[PDB]
Amino acid sequence: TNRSTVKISNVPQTIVADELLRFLELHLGEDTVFALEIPTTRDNWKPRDFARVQFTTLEVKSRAQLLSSQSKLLFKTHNLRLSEAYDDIIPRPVDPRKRLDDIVLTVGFPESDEKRFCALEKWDGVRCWILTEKRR
């Protein structure tokens, strides 16, 4: 429940990432897959037997795990088996409210004896990702 990145056990080695992406978006909801990565032994022409998929929420991840445990994911005569990965593909918090977009960040220190704040520089339009699982 900490991460949403799922590792598929047996993907076919004759496919591309778009064919798996369209299959996962056809079985599950539309554009519910955030990241998808097939590791290659060579540079760009030899994919491996497994792949990592990262979803957008935990409910679609649990739904994909329930579909994989009931043997309902048949992709080119291959039954996909989901497991747990080691880390996220992108260090992004799975929360629609924690990803603060287009906010104002300013730096400084309290100047006087009161609780004031003097600003050296100002940054406009920055991101803010609160990673609770990675504690940063």
Partner: peptide, 9 residues
Amino acid sequence: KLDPDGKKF
């Protein structure tokens, strides 16, 4: 576990 783990192998 199934060793081919497929449907129409």
